[PDB]
Design an enzyme around this catalytic site. Structure first.
Site, PDB file in Angstrom:
ATOM      1  N   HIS A   1       0.425 -80.658 -64.431  1.00 60.54           N
ATOM      2  CA  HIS A   1       1.479 -79.772 -63.913  1.00 60.54           C
ATOM      3  C   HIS A   1       0.992 -78.349 -63.665  1.00 60.54           C
ATOM      4  O   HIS A   1       1.584 -77.652 -62.862  1.00 60.54           O
ATOM      5  CB  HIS A   1       2.796 -79.803 -64.688  1.00 60.54           C
TER       6      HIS A   1
ATOM      7  N   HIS B   1      -1.813 -69.909 -68.234  1.00 60.37           N
ATOM      8  CA  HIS B   1      -1.665 -70.752 -67.059  1.00 60.37           C
ATOM      9  C   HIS B   1      -0.830 -69.978 -66.066  1.00 60.37           C
ATOM     10  O   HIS B   1      -0.323 -68.899 -66.359  1.00 60.37           O
ATOM     11  CB  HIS B   1      -0.974 -72.095 -67.380  1.00 60.37           C
TER      12      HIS B   1
ATOM     13  N   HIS C   1       1.319 -66.750 -67.145  1.00 53.52           N
ATOM     14  CA  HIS C   1       1.860 -66.823 -68.505  1.00 53.52           C
ATOM     15  C   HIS C   1       0.759 -66.844 -69.524  1.00 53.52           C
ATOM     16  O   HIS C   1       0.008 -67.807 -69.568  1.00 53.52           O
ATOM     17  CB  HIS C   1       2.744 -68.076 -68.679  1.00 53.52           C
TER      18      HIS C   1
HETATM   19  S1  LIG Z   1       5.686 -72.555 -69.236  1.00 50.68           S
HETATM   20  C1  LIG Z   1       5.112 -72.221 -70.875  1.00 50.68           C
HETATM   21  S2  LIG Z   1       4.793 -70.549 -71.216  1.00 50.68           S
HETATM   22  N1  LIG Z   1       4.400 -73.224 -71.561  1.00 50.68           N
HETATM   23  C2  LIG Z   1       4.876 -74.537 -71.454  1.00 50.68           C
HETATM   24  C3  LIG Z   1       3.862 -75.513 -71.890  1.00 50.68           C
HETATM   25  O1  LIG Z   1       3.308 -75.169 -73.124  1.00 50.68           O
HETATM   26  C4  LIG Z   1       2.875 -73.855 -73.307  1.00 50.68           C
HETATM   27  C5  LIG Z   1       3.856 -72.864 -72.810  1.00 50.68           C
HETATM   28 ZN   LIG Z   2       4.504 -71.132 -67.890  1.00 48.16          ZN
END
Ligand SMILES: S=C(S)N1CCOCC1
Ligand SMILES: [Zn+2]
Length: 257
Positions: free
Chosen positions: A61, A91, A116
Protein backbone atom coordinates in the site's frame (compact mmCIF):
# COMPACT_ATOMS: atom_id res chain seq x y z
CA UNK A 1 -8.42 -7.35 1.71
CA UNK A 2 -8.54 -3.59 2.14
CA UNK A 3 -6.91 -1.26 -0.36
CA UNK A 4 -7.53 1.88 -2.38
CA UNK A 5 -9.59 0.51 -5.27
CA UNK A 6 -13.28 1.01 -6.06
CA UNK A 7 -14.18 -2.28 -4.47
CA UNK A 8 -11.94 -2.24 -1.36
CA UNK A 9 -11.14 1.46 -0.81
CA UNK A 10 -11.94 3.99 1.93
CA UNK A 11 -15.72 3.77 1.55
CA UNK A 12 -15.56 0.02 2.31
CA UNK A 13 -13.16 -0.02 5.24
CA UNK A 14 -15.83 0.46 7.94
CA UNK A 15 -17.20 -3.06 7.29
CA UNK A 16 -14.01 -4.70 8.60
CA UNK A 17 -12.90 -1.73 10.78
CA UNK A 18 -15.96 -0.10 12.33
CA UNK A 19 -13.77 2.51 14.04
CA UNK A 20 -13.64 4.05 10.55
CA UNK A 21 -16.77 5.95 11.65
CA UNK A 22 -15.32 6.80 15.07
CA UNK A 23 -14.99 9.99 17.03
CA UNK A 24 -11.36 10.85 16.25
CA UNK A 25 -10.59 9.69 12.70
CA UNK A 26 -7.92 11.06 10.39
CA UNK A 27 -7.13 12.75 8.12
CA UNK A 28 -9.10 15.97 8.44
CA UNK A 29 -9.36 19.27 6.66
CA UNK A 30 -7.36 21.94 8.48
CA UNK A 31 -9.45 25.09 8.36
CA UNK A 32 -6.71 27.65 8.96
CA UNK A 33 -9.03 30.42 10.03
CA UNK A 34 -10.75 28.22 12.65
CA UNK A 35 -7.61 26.61 14.11
CA UNK A 36 -6.73 28.27 17.40
CA UNK A 37 -3.33 29.57 18.28
CA UNK A 38 -2.25 28.03 21.58
CA UNK A 39 0.55 30.14 23.09
CA UNK A 40 1.18 27.36 25.64
CA UNK A 41 2.27 24.87 22.93
CA UNK A 42 6.02 24.29 23.20
CA UNK A 43 8.36 24.24 20.23
CA UNK A 44 8.74 20.90 18.66
CA UNK A 45 12.00 19.01 19.31
CA UNK A 46 13.05 16.82 16.41
CA UNK A 47 16.22 14.92 17.30
CA UNK A 48 17.29 12.90 14.28
CA UNK A 49 21.10 13.22 14.35
CA UNK A 50 21.59 9.64 15.59
CA UNK A 51 18.89 8.10 13.35
CA UNK A 52 19.71 4.62 12.10
CA UNK A 53 17.76 3.63 8.98
CA UNK A 54 17.76 -0.05 8.10
CA UNK A 55 15.55 -1.07 5.23
CA UNK A 56 12.92 0.05 2.73
CA UNK A 57 9.88 -2.17 2.12
CA UNK A 58 7.02 -2.11 -0.42
CA UNK A 59 4.17 -3.42 1.77
CA UNK A 60 1.54 -3.35 -0.95
CA UNK A 61 0.00 0.00 0.00
CA UNK A 62 3.04 2.28 0.36
CA UNK A 63 6.79 2.00 0.95
CA UNK A 64 8.16 2.19 4.49
CA UNK A 65 11.69 3.36 5.34
CA UNK A 66 12.33 1.57 8.63
CA UNK A 67 14.56 2.62 11.54
CA UNK A 68 16.22 0.99 14.54
CA UNK A 69 13.77 1.87 17.29
CA UNK A 70 15.39 -0.36 19.95
CA UNK A 71 17.06 2.74 21.53
CA UNK A 72 16.36 6.51 21.68
CA UNK A 73 18.25 7.25 18.44
CA UNK A 74 15.74 9.44 16.61
CA UNK A 75 13.07 11.00 18.79
CA UNK A 76 10.30 13.53 18.75
CA UNK A 77 9.52 15.49 21.90
CA UNK A 78 7.93 18.78 22.94
CA UNK A 79 5.13 20.47 21.08
CA UNK A 80 1.87 19.00 22.41
CA UNK A 81 3.65 15.86 23.56
CA UNK A 82 4.43 14.58 27.02
CA UNK A 83 7.42 12.25 27.03
CA UNK A 84 9.54 10.78 24.26
CA UNK A 85 8.40 9.28 20.99
CA UNK A 86 10.77 7.11 18.92
CA UNK A 87 10.92 7.13 15.14
CA UNK A 88 10.02 3.70 13.75
CA UNK A 89 9.40 4.41 10.04
CA UNK A 90 8.34 6.96 7.47
CA UNK A 91 6.20 6.59 4.40
CA UNK A 92 4.19 8.74 1.99
CA UNK A 93 0.72 8.97 0.52
CA UNK A 94 0.49 10.33 -3.06
CA UNK A 95 -1.67 10.89 -6.05
CA UNK A 96 -1.99 9.89 -9.69
CA UNK A 97 -1.95 13.63 -10.56
CA UNK A 98 -0.15 16.57 -8.91
CA UNK A 99 -3.49 18.07 -7.77
CA UNK A 100 -4.22 15.26 -5.30
CA UNK A 101 -2.39 12.88 -3.00
CA UNK A 102 -2.30 14.37 0.47
CA UNK A 103 -4.52 13.03 3.22
CA UNK A 104 -4.79 16.22 5.31
CA UNK A 105 -5.98 19.23 3.39
CA UNK A 106 -5.50 22.91 4.18
CA UNK A 107 -8.59 25.03 3.54
CA UNK A 108 -9.66 22.16 1.27
CA UNK A 109 -6.40 22.35 -0.72
CA UNK A 110 -4.85 19.00 -1.64
CA UNK A 111 -1.11 18.65 -1.95
CA UNK A 112 0.65 16.22 -4.32
CA UNK A 113 1.74 13.96 -1.46
CA UNK A 114 2.13 13.76 2.29
CA UNK A 115 5.01 12.36 4.32
CA UNK A 116 4.32 10.60 7.61
CA UNK A 117 7.16 10.22 10.12
CA UNK A 118 5.77 7.70 12.59
CA UNK A 119 6.86 7.72 16.25
CA UNK A 120 5.74 5.69 19.28
CA UNK A 121 5.57 6.66 22.95
CA UNK A 122 8.42 4.93 24.78
CA UNK A 123 6.35 4.57 27.95
CA UNK A 124 4.53 1.73 26.14
CA UNK A 125 7.65 -0.32 25.35
CA UNK A 126 6.94 -1.27 21.75
CA UNK A 127 4.91 -0.10 18.74
CA UNK A 128 2.30 -2.87 19.02
CA UNK A 129 1.44 -1.83 22.57
CA UNK A 130 1.57 1.89 21.71
CA UNK A 131 -1.09 1.66 19.00
CA UNK A 132 -3.57 0.39 21.63
CA UNK A 133 -3.22 3.66 23.60
CA UNK A 134 -4.86 7.09 23.01
CA UNK A 135 -1.44 8.74 23.27
CA UNK A 136 0.53 5.92 21.69
CA UNK A 137 1.81 7.54 18.50
CA UNK A 138 2.96 10.94 17.32
CA UNK A 139 2.95 11.31 13.53
CA UNK A 140 4.76 14.24 11.96
CA UNK A 141 2.98 15.07 8.71
CA UNK A 142 4.67 17.07 5.99
CA UNK A 143 3.06 18.20 2.75
CA UNK A 144 4.76 17.83 -0.62
CA UNK A 145 4.23 20.22 -3.51
CA UNK A 146 5.69 19.83 -6.96
CA UNK A 147 8.33 22.38 -7.90
CA UNK A 148 12.08 22.20 -7.30
CA UNK A 149 13.69 18.90 -6.32
CA UNK A 150 14.21 17.95 -2.69
CA UNK A 151 17.81 16.74 -2.62
CA UNK A 152 17.38 14.80 0.59
CA UNK A 153 14.60 12.74 -1.04
CA UNK A 154 16.67 11.54 -3.96
CA UNK A 155 18.26 8.52 -2.26
CA UNK A 156 14.71 7.25 -1.57
CA UNK A 157 13.62 7.82 -5.17
CA UNK A 158 16.63 6.01 -6.55
CA UNK A 159 16.03 2.76 -4.65
CA UNK A 160 12.35 2.47 -5.69
CA UNK A 161 13.25 0.43 -8.82
CA UNK A 162 14.52 -2.29 -6.48
CA UNK A 163 11.23 -2.55 -4.53
CA UNK A 164 8.76 -2.20 -7.36
CA UNK A 165 6.30 -4.83 -6.15
CA UNK A 166 4.57 -5.89 -2.94
CA UNK A 167 6.81 -7.68 -0.47
CA UNK A 168 10.11 -6.51 -1.91
CA UNK A 169 12.62 -4.91 0.41
CA UNK A 170 16.12 -3.49 0.13
CA UNK A 171 18.89 -2.44 2.49
CA UNK A 172 18.53 1.24 3.25
CA UNK A 173 21.15 2.16 5.78
CA UNK A 174 22.66 5.57 6.55
CA UNK A 175 19.71 7.62 5.35
CA UNK A 176 19.32 10.93 7.16
CA UNK A 177 15.63 11.95 7.57
CA UNK A 178 16.64 15.52 8.46
CA UNK A 179 16.93 16.01 4.69
CA UNK A 180 13.14 15.66 4.40
CA UNK A 181 12.17 18.53 6.71
CA UNK A 182 11.18 22.06 5.73
CA UNK A 183 12.84 25.13 7.30
CA UNK A 184 9.99 25.93 9.69
CA UNK A 185 8.64 23.64 12.40
CA UNK A 186 5.42 25.72 12.78
CA UNK A 187 2.58 23.17 13.08
CA UNK A 188 -1.06 22.33 13.64
CA UNK A 189 -1.96 19.58 16.08
CA UNK A 190 -5.06 17.52 16.89
CA UNK A 191 -5.96 14.04 18.21
CA UNK A 192 -6.68 11.45 15.56
CA UNK A 193 -6.05 8.07 14.06
CA UNK A 194 -4.04 5.94 11.69
CA UNK A 195 -5.22 6.73 8.19
CA UNK A 196 -5.03 3.08 7.10
CA UNK A 197 -6.68 0.06 8.62
CA UNK A 198 -6.81 -0.78 11.49
CA UNK A 199 -7.60 2.98 11.82
CA UNK A 200 -6.70 2.95 15.50
CA UNK A 201 -7.37 6.15 17.45
CA UNK A 202 -3.89 6.39 18.88
CA UNK A 203 -2.24 9.35 17.11
CA UNK A 204 -1.29 12.84 18.14
CA UNK A 205 -1.06 14.49 14.73
CA UNK A 206 1.52 17.22 14.22
CA UNK A 207 1.16 18.63 10.71
CA UNK A 208 3.80 21.14 9.57
CA UNK A 209 2.53 24.37 8.01
CA UNK A 210 5.38 24.65 5.49
CA UNK A 211 5.37 22.11 2.63
CA UNK A 212 8.54 20.77 1.06
CA UNK A 213 8.96 20.98 -2.69
CA UNK A 214 9.81 17.89 -4.72
CA UNK A 215 10.37 17.72 -8.50
CA UNK A 216 7.93 16.33 -11.00
CA UNK A 217 10.50 13.59 -11.74
CA UNK A 218 10.68 12.61 -8.09
CA UNK A 219 6.93 12.16 -7.67
CA UNK A 220 6.70 10.44 -11.11
CA UNK A 221 9.00 7.76 -9.74
CA UNK A 222 6.66 7.20 -6.74
CA UNK A 223 3.91 6.54 -9.32
CA UNK A 224 5.88 3.74 -11.00
CA UNK A 225 5.65 1.53 -7.91
CA UNK A 226 3.14 -1.33 -7.91
CA UNK A 227 0.47 -2.36 -5.39
CA UNK A 228 0.66 -5.91 -6.79
CA UNK A 229 3.22 -8.64 -6.23
CA UNK A 230 5.72 -9.75 -8.84
CA UNK A 231 4.08 -11.91 -11.51
CA UNK A 232 0.68 -10.35 -10.95
CA UNK A 233 -1.09 -7.90 -13.24
CA UNK A 234 0.39 -4.45 -12.85
CA UNK A 235 -1.55 -1.98 -10.72
CA UNK A 236 0.29 1.30 -10.31
CA UNK A 237 0.67 2.41 -6.72
CA UNK A 238 -1.07 5.79 -6.90
CA UNK A 239 -3.91 7.46 -4.95
CA UNK A 240 -3.05 5.64 -1.73
CA UNK A 241 -4.68 8.35 0.39
CA UNK A 242 -7.77 8.45 2.57
CA UNK A 243 -9.95 11.55 2.12
CA UNK A 244 -10.74 14.00 4.92
CA UNK A 245 -13.03 12.70 7.69
CA UNK A 246 -15.45 14.62 9.91
CA UNK A 247 -13.78 16.73 12.59
CA UNK A 248 -16.53 15.95 15.10
CA UNK A 249 -15.76 17.11 18.61
CA UNK A 250 -12.20 18.30 18.03
CA UNK A 251 -10.37 21.60 17.82
CA UNK A 252 -7.21 21.93 15.77
CA UNK A 253 -4.54 23.97 17.56
CA UNK A 254 -1.81 26.07 15.90
CA UNK A 255 1.67 26.67 17.28
CA UNK A 256 1.91 29.96 15.41
CA UNK A 257 -0.07 33.14 14.85
S1 LIG B 1 -0.87 6.01 7.83
C1 LIG B 1 0.05 5.67 9.30
S2 LIG B 1 0.91 7.03 9.96
N1 LIG B 1 0.54 4.37 9.52
C2 LIG B 1 -0.32 3.30 9.21
C3 LIG B 1 0.41 2.03 9.12
O1 LIG B 1 1.25 1.83 10.22
C4 LIG B 1 2.08 2.88 10.61
C5 LIG B 1 1.37 4.18 10.64
ZN1 LIG C 1 0.44 7.45 6.63
Amino acid sequence: HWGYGKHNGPEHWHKDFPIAKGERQSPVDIDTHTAKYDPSLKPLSVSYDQATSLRILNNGHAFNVEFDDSQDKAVLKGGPLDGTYRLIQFHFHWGSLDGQGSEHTVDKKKYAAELHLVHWNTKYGDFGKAVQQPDGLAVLGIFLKVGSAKPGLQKVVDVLDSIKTKGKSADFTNFDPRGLLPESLDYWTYPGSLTTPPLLECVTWIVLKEPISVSSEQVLKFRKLNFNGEGEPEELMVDNWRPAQPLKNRQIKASFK
